[PDB]
mmCIF file of N, CA and C in Angstrom:
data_model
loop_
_atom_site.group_PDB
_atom_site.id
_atom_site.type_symbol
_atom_site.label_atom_id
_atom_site.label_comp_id
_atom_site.label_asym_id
_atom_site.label_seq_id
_atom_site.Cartn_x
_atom_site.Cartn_y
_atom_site.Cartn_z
ATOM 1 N N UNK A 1 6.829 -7.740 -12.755
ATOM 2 C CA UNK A 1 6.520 -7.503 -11.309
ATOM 3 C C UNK A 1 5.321 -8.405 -10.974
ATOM 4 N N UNK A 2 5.438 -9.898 -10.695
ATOM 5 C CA UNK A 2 4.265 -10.462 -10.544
ATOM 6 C C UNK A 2 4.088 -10.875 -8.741
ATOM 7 N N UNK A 3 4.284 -9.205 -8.616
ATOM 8 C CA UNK A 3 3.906 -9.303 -6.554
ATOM 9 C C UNK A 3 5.057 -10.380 -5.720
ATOM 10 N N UNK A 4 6.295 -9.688 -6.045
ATOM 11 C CA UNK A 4 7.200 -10.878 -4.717
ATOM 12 C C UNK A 4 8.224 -9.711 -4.266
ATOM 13 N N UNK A 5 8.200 -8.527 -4.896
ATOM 14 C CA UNK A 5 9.117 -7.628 -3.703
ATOM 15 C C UNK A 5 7.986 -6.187 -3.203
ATOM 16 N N UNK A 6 7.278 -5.754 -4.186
ATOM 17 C CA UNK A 6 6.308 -5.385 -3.624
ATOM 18 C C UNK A 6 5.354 -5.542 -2.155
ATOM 19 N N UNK A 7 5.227 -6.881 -1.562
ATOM 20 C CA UNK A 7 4.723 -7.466 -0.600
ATOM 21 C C UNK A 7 5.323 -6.896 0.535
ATOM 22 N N UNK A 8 6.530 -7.452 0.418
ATOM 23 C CA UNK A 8 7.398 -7.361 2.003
ATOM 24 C C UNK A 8 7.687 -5.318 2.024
ATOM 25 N N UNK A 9 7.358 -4.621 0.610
ATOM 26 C CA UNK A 9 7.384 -2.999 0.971
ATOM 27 C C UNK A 9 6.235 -2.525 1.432
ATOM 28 N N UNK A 10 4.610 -2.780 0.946
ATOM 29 C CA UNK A 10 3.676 -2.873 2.164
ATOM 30 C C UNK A 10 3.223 -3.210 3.314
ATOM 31 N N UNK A 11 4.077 -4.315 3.012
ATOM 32 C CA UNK A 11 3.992 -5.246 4.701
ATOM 33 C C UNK A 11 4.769 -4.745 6.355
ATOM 34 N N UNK A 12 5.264 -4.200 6.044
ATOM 35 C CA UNK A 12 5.460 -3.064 7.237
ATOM 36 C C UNK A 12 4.670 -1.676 7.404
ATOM 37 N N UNK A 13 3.798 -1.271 6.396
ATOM 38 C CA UNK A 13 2.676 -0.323 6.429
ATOM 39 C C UNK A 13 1.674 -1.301 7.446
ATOM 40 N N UNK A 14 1.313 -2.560 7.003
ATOM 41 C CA UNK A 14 0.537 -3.358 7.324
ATOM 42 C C UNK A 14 -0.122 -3.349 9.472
ATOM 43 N N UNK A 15 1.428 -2.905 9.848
ATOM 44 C CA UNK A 15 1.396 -3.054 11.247
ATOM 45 C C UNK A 15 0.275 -2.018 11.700
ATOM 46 N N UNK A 16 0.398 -1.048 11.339
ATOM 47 C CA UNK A 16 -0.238 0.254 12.207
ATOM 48 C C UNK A 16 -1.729 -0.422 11.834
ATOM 49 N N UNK A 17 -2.194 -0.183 10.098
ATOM 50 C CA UNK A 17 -3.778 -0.939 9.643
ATOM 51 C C UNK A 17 -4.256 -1.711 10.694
ATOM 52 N N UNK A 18 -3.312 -2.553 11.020
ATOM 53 C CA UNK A 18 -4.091 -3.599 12.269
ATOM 54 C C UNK A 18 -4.689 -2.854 13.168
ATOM 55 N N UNK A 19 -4.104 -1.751 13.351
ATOM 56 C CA UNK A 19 -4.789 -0.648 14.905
ATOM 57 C C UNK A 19 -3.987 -0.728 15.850
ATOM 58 N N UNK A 20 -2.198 -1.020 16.042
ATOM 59 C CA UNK A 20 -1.678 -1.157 17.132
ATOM 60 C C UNK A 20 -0.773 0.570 16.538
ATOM 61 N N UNK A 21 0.562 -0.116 17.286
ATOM 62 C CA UNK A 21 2.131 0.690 16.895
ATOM 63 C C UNK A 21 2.437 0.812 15.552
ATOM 64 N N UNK A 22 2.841 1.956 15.015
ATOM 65 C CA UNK A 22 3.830 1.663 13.509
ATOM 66 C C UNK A 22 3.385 2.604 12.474
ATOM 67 N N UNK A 23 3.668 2.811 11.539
ATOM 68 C CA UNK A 23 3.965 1.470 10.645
ATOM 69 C C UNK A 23 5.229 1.030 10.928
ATOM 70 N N UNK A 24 6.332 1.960 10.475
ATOM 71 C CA UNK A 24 7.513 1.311 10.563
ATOM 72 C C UNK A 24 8.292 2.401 9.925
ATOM 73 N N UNK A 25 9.533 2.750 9.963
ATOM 74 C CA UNK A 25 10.466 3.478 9.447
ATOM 75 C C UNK A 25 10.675 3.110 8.076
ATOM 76 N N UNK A 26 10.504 2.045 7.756
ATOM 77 C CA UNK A 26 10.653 1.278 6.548
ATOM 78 C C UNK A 26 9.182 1.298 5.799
ATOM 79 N N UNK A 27 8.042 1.501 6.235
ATOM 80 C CA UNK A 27 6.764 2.177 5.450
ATOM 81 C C UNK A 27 6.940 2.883 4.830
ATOM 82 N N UNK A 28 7.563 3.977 5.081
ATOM 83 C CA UNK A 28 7.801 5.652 4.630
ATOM 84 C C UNK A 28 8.687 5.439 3.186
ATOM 85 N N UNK A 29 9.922 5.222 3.749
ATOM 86 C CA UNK A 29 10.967 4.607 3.256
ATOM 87 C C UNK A 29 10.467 3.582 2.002
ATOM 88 N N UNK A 30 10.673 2.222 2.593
ATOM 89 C CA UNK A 30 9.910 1.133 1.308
ATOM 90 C C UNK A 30 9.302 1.388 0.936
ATOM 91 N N UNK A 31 8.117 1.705 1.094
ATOM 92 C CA UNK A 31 6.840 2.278 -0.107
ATOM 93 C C UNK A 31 6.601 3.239 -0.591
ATOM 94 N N UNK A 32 7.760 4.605 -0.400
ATOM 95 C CA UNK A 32 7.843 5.836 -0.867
ATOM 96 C C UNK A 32 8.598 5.142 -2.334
ATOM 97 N N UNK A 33 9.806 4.400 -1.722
ATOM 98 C CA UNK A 33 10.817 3.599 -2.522
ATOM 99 C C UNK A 33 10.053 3.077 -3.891
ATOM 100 N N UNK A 34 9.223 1.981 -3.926
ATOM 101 C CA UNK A 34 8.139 1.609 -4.888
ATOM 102 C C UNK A 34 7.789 2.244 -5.397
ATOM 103 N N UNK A 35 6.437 3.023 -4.937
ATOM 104 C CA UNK A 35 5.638 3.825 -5.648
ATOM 105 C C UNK A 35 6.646 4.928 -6.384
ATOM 106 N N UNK A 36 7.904 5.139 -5.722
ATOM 107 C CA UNK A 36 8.445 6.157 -7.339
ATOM 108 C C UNK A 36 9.187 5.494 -8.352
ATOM 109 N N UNK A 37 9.779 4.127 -7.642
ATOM 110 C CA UNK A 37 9.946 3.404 -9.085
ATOM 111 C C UNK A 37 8.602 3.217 -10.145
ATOM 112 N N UNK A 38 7.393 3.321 -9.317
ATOM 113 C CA UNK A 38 6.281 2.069 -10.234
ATOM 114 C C UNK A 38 5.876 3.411 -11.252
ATOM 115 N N UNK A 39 6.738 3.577 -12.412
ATOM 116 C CA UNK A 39 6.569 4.633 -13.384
ATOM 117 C C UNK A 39 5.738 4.310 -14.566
ATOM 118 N N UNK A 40 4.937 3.195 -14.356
ATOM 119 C CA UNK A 40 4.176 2.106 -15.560
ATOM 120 C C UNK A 40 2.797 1.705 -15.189
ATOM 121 N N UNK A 41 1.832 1.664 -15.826
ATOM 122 C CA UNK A 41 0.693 1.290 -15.243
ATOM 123 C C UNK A 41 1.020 -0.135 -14.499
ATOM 124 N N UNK A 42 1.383 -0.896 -14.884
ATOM 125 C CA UNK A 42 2.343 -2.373 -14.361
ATOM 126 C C UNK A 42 2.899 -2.311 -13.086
ATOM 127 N N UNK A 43 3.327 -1.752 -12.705
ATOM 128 C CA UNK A 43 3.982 -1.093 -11.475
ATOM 129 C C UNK A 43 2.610 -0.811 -10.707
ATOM 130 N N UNK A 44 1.718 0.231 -11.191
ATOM 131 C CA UNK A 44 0.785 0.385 -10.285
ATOM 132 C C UNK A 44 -0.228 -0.563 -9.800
ATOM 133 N N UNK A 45 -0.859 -0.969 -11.185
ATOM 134 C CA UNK A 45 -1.679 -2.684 -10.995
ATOM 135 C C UNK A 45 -0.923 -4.161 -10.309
ATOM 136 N N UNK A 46 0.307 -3.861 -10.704
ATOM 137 C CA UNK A 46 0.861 -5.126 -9.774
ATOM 138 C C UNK A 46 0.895 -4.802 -8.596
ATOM 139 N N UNK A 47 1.550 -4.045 -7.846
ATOM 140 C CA UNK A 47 1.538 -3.421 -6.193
ATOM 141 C C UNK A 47 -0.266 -3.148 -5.748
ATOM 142 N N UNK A 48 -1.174 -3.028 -6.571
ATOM 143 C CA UNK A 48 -2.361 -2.873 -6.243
ATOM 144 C C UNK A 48 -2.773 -4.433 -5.661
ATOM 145 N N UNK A 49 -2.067 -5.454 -6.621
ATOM 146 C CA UNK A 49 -2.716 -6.711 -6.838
ATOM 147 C C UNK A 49 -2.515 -7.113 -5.109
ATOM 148 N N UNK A 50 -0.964 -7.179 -4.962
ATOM 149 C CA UNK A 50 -0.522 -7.094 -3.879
ATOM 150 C C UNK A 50 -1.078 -7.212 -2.372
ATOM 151 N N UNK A 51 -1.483 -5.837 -1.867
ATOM 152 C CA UNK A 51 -1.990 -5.436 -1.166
ATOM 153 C C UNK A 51 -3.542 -5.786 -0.952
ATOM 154 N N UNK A 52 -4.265 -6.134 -2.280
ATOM 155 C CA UNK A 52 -5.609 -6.893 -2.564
ATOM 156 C C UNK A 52 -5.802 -7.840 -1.633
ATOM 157 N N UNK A 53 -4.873 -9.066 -2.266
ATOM 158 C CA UNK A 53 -4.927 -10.633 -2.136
ATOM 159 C C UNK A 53 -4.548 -10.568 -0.087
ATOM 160 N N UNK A 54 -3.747 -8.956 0.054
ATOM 161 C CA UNK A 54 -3.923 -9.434 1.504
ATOM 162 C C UNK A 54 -4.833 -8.799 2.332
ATOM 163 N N UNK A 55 -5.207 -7.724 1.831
ATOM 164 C CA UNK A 55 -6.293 -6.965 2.665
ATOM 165 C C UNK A 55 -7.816 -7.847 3.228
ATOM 166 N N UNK A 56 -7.667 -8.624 1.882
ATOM 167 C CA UNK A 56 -9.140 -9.909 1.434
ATOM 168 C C UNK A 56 -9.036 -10.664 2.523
ATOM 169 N N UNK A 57 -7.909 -10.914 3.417
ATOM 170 C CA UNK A 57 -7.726 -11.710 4.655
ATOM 171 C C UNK A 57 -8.380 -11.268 5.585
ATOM 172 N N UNK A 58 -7.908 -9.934 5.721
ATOM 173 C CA UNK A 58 -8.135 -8.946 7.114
ATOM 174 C C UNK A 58 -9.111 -8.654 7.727
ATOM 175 N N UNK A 59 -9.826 -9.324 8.799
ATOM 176 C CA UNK A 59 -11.526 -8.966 9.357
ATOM 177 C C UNK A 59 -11.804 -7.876 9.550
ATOM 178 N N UNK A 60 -10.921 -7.060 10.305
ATOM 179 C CA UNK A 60 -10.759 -6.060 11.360
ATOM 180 C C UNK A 60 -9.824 -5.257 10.903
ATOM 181 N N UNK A 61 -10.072 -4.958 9.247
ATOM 182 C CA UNK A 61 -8.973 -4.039 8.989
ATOM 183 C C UNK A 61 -9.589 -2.963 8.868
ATOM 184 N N UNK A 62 -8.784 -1.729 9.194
ATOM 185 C CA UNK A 62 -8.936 -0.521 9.363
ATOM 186 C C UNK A 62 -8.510 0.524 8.369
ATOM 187 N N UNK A 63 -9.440 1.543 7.839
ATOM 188 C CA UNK A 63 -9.389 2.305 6.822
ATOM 189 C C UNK A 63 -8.395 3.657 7.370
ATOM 190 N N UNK A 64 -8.776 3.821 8.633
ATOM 191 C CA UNK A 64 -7.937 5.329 9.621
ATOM 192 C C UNK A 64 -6.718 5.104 9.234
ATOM 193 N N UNK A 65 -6.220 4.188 9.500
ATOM 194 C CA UNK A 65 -5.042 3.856 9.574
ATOM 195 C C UNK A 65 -4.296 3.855 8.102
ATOM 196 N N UNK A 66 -4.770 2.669 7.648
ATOM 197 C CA UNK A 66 -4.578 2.605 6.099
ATOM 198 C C UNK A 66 -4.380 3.810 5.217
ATOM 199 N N UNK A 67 -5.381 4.539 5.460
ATOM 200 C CA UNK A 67 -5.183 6.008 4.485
ATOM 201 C C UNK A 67 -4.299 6.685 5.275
ATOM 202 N N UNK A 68 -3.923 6.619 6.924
ATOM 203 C CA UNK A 68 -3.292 7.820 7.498
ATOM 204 C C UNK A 68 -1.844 7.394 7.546
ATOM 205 N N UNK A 69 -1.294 6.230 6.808
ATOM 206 C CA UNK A 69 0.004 5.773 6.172
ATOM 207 C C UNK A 69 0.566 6.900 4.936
ATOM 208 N N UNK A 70 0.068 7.294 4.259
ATOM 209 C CA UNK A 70 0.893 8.074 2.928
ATOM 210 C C UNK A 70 0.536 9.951 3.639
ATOM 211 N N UNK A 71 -0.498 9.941 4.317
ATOM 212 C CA UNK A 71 -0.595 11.179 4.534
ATOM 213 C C UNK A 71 0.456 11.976 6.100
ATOM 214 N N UNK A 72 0.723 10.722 6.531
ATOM 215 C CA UNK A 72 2.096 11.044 7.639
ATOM 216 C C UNK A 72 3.085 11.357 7.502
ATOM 217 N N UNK A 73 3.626 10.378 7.020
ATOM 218 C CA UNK A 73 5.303 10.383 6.281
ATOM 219 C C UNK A 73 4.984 11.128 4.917
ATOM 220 N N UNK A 74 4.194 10.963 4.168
ATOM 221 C CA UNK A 74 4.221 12.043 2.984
ATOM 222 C C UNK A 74 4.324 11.268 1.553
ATOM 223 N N UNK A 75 3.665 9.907 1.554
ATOM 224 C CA UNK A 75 4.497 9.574 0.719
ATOM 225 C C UNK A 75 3.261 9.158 -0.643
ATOM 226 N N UNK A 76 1.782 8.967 -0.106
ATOM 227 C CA UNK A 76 0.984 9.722 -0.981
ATOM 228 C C UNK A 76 0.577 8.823 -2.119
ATOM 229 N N UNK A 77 -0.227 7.621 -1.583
ATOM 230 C CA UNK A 77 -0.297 5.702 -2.012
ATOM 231 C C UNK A 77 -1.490 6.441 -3.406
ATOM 232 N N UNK A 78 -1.626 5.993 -4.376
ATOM 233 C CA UNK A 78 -2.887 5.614 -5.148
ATOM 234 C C UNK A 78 -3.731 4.531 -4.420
ATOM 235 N N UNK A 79 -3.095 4.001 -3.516
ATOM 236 C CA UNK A 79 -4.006 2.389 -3.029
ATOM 237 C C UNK A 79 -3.288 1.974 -1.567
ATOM 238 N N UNK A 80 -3.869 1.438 -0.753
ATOM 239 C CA UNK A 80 -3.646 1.313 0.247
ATOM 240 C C UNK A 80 -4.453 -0.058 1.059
ATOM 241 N N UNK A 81 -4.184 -0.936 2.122
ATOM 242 C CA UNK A 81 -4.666 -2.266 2.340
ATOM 243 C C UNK A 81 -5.667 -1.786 2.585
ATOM 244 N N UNK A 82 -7.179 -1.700 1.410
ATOM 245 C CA UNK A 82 -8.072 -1.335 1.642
ATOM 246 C C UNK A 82 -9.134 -2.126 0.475
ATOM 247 N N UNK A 83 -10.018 -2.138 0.045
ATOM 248 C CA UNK A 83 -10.756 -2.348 -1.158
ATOM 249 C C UNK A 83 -11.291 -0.857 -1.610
ATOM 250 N N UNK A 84 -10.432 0.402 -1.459
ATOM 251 C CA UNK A 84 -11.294 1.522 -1.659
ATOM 252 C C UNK A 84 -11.069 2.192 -2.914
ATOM 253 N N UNK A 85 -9.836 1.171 -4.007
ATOM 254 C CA UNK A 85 -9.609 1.611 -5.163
ATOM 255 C C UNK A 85 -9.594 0.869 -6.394
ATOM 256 N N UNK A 86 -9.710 1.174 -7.635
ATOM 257 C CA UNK A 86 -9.210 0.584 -8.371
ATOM 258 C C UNK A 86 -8.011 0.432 -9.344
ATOM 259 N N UNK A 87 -6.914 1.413 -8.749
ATOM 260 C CA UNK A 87 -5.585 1.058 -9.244
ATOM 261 C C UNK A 87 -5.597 0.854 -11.068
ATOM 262 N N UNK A 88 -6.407 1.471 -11.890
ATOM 263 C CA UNK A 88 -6.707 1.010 -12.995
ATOM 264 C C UNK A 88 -6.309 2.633 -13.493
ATOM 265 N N UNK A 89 -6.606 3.766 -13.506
ATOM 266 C CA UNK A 89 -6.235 5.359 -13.806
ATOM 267 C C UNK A 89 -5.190 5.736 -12.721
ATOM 268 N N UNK A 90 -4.185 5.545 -11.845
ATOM 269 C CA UNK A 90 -3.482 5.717 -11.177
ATOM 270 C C UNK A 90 -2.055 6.010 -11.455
#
């Protein structure tokens, strides 16, 4: 898992973080999807890596949002487009 299907399953979480509409039907869905495949520390550190390399972009990214993605739909992230974890005991 060296981060190329992982991406595009956070990347519709990604919308709402910005602070507009969303996430997406496919947030819930795709990244519920992941996180119960990712049954390996590998799984968890790679999808962590993920979400890293893009959060590191984001000026104006938002934590409300970010955390209020797994606690909506239910689906309950170890990590989220944030720098607020380390995905390392997860």
């Amino acid at each position: 898992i060296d981060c190329g299907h992982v991406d595009s399953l956070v990347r519709p979480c990604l919308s709402y973080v910005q602070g507009g509409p969303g996430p997406s039907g496919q947030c819930c869905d795709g990244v519920k999807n992941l996180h119960n495949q990712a049954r390996s520390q590998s799984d968890r550190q790679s999808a962590c890596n993920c979400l890293k390399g893009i959060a590191r972009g984001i000026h104006n990214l938002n934590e409300d949002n970010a955390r209020s993605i797994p606690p909506k739909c239910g689906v309950n992230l170890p990590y989220t487009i944030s720098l607020n974890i380390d995905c390392s005991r997860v």
